[PDB]
Amino acid sequence: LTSNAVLTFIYFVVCIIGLCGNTLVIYVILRYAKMKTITNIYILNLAIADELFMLGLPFLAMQVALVHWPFGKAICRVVMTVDGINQFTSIFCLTVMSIDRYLAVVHPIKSAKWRRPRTAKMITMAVWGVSLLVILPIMIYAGLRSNQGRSSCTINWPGESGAWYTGFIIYTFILGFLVPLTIICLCYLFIIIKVKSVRLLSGSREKDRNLRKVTRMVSIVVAVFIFCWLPFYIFNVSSVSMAISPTPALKGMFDFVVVLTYANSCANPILYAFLSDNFKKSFQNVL
């Protein structure tokens, strides 16, 4: 109806914005800047994962617009596998970056041996492999379900058992939300305490302004993550726990919440790359 057009239009807008931002970040790191520092190595991987993650939306728009899967089963299976890999890789990269920022500041002398570019590349290669390994169920048991001349791509579960749904939702909730959030929060709290202790950083009003800015950015990152991901999980958990009658407003709420899970990728480059002072000169020179 009327809702489908607006939903498809929002999907396209999000896809375009994400592709533009991630492409510009990679264009800058690859040329004007370089990957000498550990930070730049960690930012480029995040950008690549987000860009790959943003190319799966058009199929979902072509399905919201008309309630049928126009393409073949194999293509939808590939799409499910890719989306899963990119999503988990992005979340893991965020957690890694937070641990690195905690080690550099809280233990500057002891960590000097550990922090080197070779180890950073090793960490990244490990992350991709774990992300590939965790998404195995989606790739194995993804298919198409049709009942009527209308089909949809979905995860068929063996034995028609109503428990696989719960045991999948719990698994995704535990490994995709709770643990990264507790780690990021603990690291940022200890960083703020340490920064408060240092004598050279505190004791004047102009210095207090900088401490305020550090606190502001640390709070913003956590707020964006929670806002962009909690509604998806709560909707899925409620649906699995209890039967819900389908309604059109429910259809529009479900589609909007699912689209919301991709705003985080659009917002990652601004938070980590654009605000950084190190990148300002390179951006200035490029354009």
């Binding site: 989306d83 949809s152 696989w164």
Partner: peptide, 14 residues
Amino acid sequence: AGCKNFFWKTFTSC
């Protein structure tokens, strides 16, 4: 299998 209208990123019409 059993049809749940809302699951993961898709709405299956049953």
